[PDB]
Amino acid sequence: CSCNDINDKECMYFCHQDVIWDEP
Structure with a gap:
């Protein structure tokens, strides 16, 4: 998984x- 700009x-x-x- 990759998150940084998005919340936990x-x-x-x-x-x-x-x-x-x-992209979905």
């Missing part, structure tokens, strides 16, 4: 989700 709640959400995307 959203970060962890898709972190265990493993969103290998960038």
Whole structure:
């Protein structure tokens, strides 16, 4: 997962989700 510009709640959400995307 990659988060820095975004918040922790959203970060962890898709972190265990493993969103290998960038543009949805």
